[PDB]
Design a protein around this nucleic acid. Structure first.
Ligand SMILES: [Mg+2]
Lengths: 304, 144, 372, 42
DNA sequence: CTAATAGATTAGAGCCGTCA
RNA sequence: UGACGGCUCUAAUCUAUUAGU
């Protein structure tokens, strides 16, 4: 259950990359039918297996497969997701900063922030006012040191709406008059819809606006280049709600759509949710395996 | 009447200042941005794991074909796409435990079994990294 | 034109079945003749790819020539081909990958991308069209005992601080206890439904949110009440009851050229649904579809995991057209009227819900005739 | 301070602290892969 | 100062398959 | 733990009312 989590968590203190490969992937020949039903199969998909592995290993070597270049310079980005540890007093307090994008003249930064700040409450999530100030200040000095100047515009993602006091505290730690906005992104909300004619689902990239604040987006259709569906059955969309701030809907929607292909762990053409939420989700269980670590690194090579 | 607004796909950057939508064909055409060419690796496991890893490593040099071309772009070869060397003749292997004193007689408190497994693997890796001379880059772990 | 007037080299490819092709042999003979014409440097440079093609069993006319190998790795073959080419003093040209990108996108652009044609889509929701203008609350602090709960009652009635939230008349409870009419209705309370749906109503004891909660609870229980007498029964679920119908109960298991109860792994499967009301964008009804199994229609598998495997096996080969058509057919069968569905929420009051789903029109599409 | 007036040992410790902290931050923060380091001294 | 109802809003944690 | 999606089962807490301080 926690084999990989524990192994990577305890090896994290020595700064060594690693890669775990099950033998069944390598030995998919001899694990054939026990009594007439084959256990296992990659014939139809065999070539793609190589595409799944090589580039990943390349990233662990120190190579950059592909970078995105559709970002306005002099902007921010950040994400967040919580986690349940339920160690002793069933605490709900595990917040893992996801990432941040920066333009240091010519390059792109993908290191993110870390530090599992705690919270006495066990079921209400949110965040106490003290932790949030340091949480945003951290990204602030990171931007200062990687920009040799001050940041201009800031964006924030989330998973759940939040109360007034902590956003007010976030506005309190705002330097000068920079604009801050946070966007809540759910995962599943039922808006099942069909195609009137034919035998194919909706075509990927559609939208359905219900108000100047809320919005919707579809991600599992079928790209004409791929000509085949990304999901076996009819898809399920993502519901978008803007919580606070003055943010135009179309630009933020296209921005969050543009950040669903940076899945370095694989090479599938399209992915459902943006990289940020799942990326913080998959770093959280690494640090929740064992909590004796102090100041873990901020490079995602070792985590992934 | 309520209508659906459509959003087009963005574009990603590649080598030589080129652009495309899919990344696979771009890599097959232009390659990565930064050039690093050392994959001196490491591995732990049993000897059958050694031979199977060697066979799979030197197998990937030849192209391998999908069942359906139109949905999966072709894979010509690691050196064909990346311009980086990775062969099955420069591995520095460290031997694994073979007795595996843990058997069906010992199944209560599997947490302890997991602890013993991870302690053994981690100490072996750490000792190999700390004491030996050769410069290793990645560590592959295989186990049934 | 090109072979004679405007060609410098040649790149014959020795595949496994390259000898069979008559056209390649014809152009090969043409190349041999033009070489016999020129006699300057060399023209022909063979290539080999396959492992099955042994080095001796190669095409008979070309045995005299050697070949750069590609059987091991394509990179070294490309490398030695290119440096042999540049050693042969072939005229050069500065590289430009943009032309390669343009050619790649142009040669592979058709039967893909998007088309400006308009199309239509169907939704999953049904909007309400009828509702009584006002609802009524009336509590005497003595009308009912304060211990039993409201799940016992089968008609709209839920407790409250002081305003008993009922839909029908408060004197419609004679069926098991008398003296209902003895409770005078002059001291009753009324709240306009149209205004609270508009949301303009607001008081110190009733806000918009909890009264909206009240009305959605009433419409949900009314939907259950109108469903229960449809003669389609229910199976226990983690969520509300899953409603479905049996083979043979409809005429010969068929209803308008669609089949809903079938056989898979010697088990009989049916097509059920579930529903619940939502209101914020518009008063509409969520409906979702599920597939149910059974041995003979009297009992069902107990294990959820093998049920999961069976439902995946059954649903692997069902797609958008079948999904949409079956949902429309089932909802039309559910329609108790030729135009809508009535909800006899009150003693005589009812709410009408459209049996025709919503619509959508989109201005963008793809190359539809993809066949596969 | 330029002159070794306050404490030469303190100045050496400060310089080594600065170099060590910079190197450690580089190792734990960046993304590239490096093997050696050629430190110049003024 | 504890407990039954009830919606709306959240997270783990397994099983099947991978294009008819 | 080669990765992705689709389902199913389980958990809390917040927000009215109510009975025992
Ligand atoms: Mg990995």
């Amino acid at each position: 259950a926690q084999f990989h989590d524990q192994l990577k968590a305890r090896l994290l203190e020595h700064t060594i990359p690693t890669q775990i490969l099950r033998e069944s992937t390598l030995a998919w020949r001899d694990f054939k039918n026990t009594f007439g039903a084959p256990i296992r199969d990659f014939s139809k998909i065999e070539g793609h297996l190589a595409w799944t592995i090589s580039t990943a290993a390349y990233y662990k070597a120190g190579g950059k497969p592909w970078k995105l270049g559709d970002i306005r310079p002099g902007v921010c980005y950040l994400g967040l997701v919580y986690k349940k540890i339920e160690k002793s007093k069933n605490p709900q307090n595990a917040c893992c900063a996801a990432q941040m994008f920066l333009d240091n003249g010519d390059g792109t930064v993908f290191k993110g922030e870390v530090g599992p700040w705690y919270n006495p409450e066990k079921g209400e999530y949110h965040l106490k006012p003290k932790e949030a100030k340091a949480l945003l200040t951290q990204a602030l000095e990171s931007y200062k040191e990687q920009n040799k100047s001050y940041p201009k515009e800031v964006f924030i993602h989330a998973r759940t709406r939040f109360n007034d006091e902590e956003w007010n505290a976030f506005n309190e730690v705002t330097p000068k008059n920079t604009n801050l906005v946070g966007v809540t992104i759910t995962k599943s909300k039922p808006l099942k819809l069909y195609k009137t004619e034919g035998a194919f689902p909706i075509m990927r990239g559609n939208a359905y606006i219900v108000d100047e604040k809320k919005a919707f987006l579809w991600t599992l259709g079928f790209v004409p280049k791929l000509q085949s569906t990304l999901s076996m059955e009819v898809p399920n969309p993502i519901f978008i709600e803007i919580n606070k701030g003055e943010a135009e809907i179309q630009q933020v929607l296209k921005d969050i759509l543009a950040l669903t292909k940076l899945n370095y762990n694989a090479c599938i053409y399209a992915d459902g949710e943006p990289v940020t939420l799942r990326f913080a989700n998959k770093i959280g269980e690494i640090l929740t395996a064992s909590t004796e670590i102090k100041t873990p690194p901020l490079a995602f090579k070792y985590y992934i | 009447m309520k209508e659906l607004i459509y959003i087009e796909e963005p574009s990603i950057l590649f080598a030589h200042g080129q652009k495309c939508t899919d990344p696979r064909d771009g890599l097959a055409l232009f390659g990565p941005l930064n050039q690093i060419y050392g994959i001196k690796s490491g591995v732990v496991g049993t000897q059958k794991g050694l031979q199977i890893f060697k066979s799979y490593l030197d197998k990937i040099q030849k192209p391998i074909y999908n069942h359906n071309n139109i949905t999966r772009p072709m894979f010509p070869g690691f050196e064909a796409v990346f311009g980086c060397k990775w062969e099955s003749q420069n591995i520095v292997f460290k031997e694994i435990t073979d007795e595996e004193i843990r058997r069906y007689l010992f199944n209560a408190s599997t947490h302890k079994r997991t602890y013993d497994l991870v302690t053994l693997f981690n100490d072996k890796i750490i000792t190999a990294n700390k004491n030996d001379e050769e410069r290793v880059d990645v560590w592959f772990v295989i186990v049934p | 034109k090109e072979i004679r007037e405007n060609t410098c080299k040649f790149l014959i490819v020795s595949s496994t079945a390259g000898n069979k092709r008559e056209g390649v042999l014809k152009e090969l003979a043409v190349a041999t003749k033009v070489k016999k014409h020129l006699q300057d440097d060399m023209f022909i440079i063979p290539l080999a790819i396959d492992e099955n093609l042994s080095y001796d069993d190669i095409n008979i006319e070309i045995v005299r020539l050697n070949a750069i190998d590609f059987k091991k790795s394509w990179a070294k073959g490309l490398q030695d081909l290119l440096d042999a080419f540049e050693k042969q003093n072939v005229p050069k040209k500065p590289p430009d990958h943009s032309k390669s990108n343009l050619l790649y996108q142009q040669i592979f652009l058709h039967d893909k991308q998007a088309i400006e044609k308009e199309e239509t889509y169907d939704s999953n929701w049904f909007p309400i069209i009828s509702f009584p203008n006002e609802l009524r609350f009336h509590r005497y602090d003595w009308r009912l005992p304060k211990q039993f709960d409201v799940r016992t009652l089968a008609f709209p009635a839920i407790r409250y601080k002081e305003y008993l939230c009922t839909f029908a008349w408060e004197y419609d409870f004679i069926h098991q206890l008398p003296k209902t009419e003895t409770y005078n209705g002059q001291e009753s309370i009324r709240i306009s439904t149209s205004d609270i749906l508009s949301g303009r109503y607001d008081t110190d004891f009733i806000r918009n949110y909890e009264c909206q909660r009240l009305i959605v609870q009433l419409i949900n229980k009314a939907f259950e009440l109108r469903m229960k007498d449809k003669n389609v029964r229910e199976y226990q679920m983690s969520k509300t009851f899953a409603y479905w119908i049996e083979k043979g109960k409809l005429e010969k298991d068929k209803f308008e050229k669609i089949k809903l109860v079938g056989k898979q792994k010697n088990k009989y499967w049916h097509f059920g649904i579930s529903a619940a009301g939502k209101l914020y964008p518009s008063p509409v009804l969520m409906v979702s579809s599920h597939i149910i199994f059974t041995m003979d229609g009297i009992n069902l598998i107990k294990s959820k995991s093998i049920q999961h495997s069976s439902r995946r096996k059954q649903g692997k080969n069902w797609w958008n057209d079948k999904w949409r058509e079956k949902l429309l057919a089932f909802i039309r069968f559910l329609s108790d009227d030729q135009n809508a569905i009535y909800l006899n929420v009150g003693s005589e009051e009812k709410i009408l819900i459209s049996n025709k789903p919503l619509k959508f029109f989109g201005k963008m599409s793809y190359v539809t005739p993809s066949e596969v």
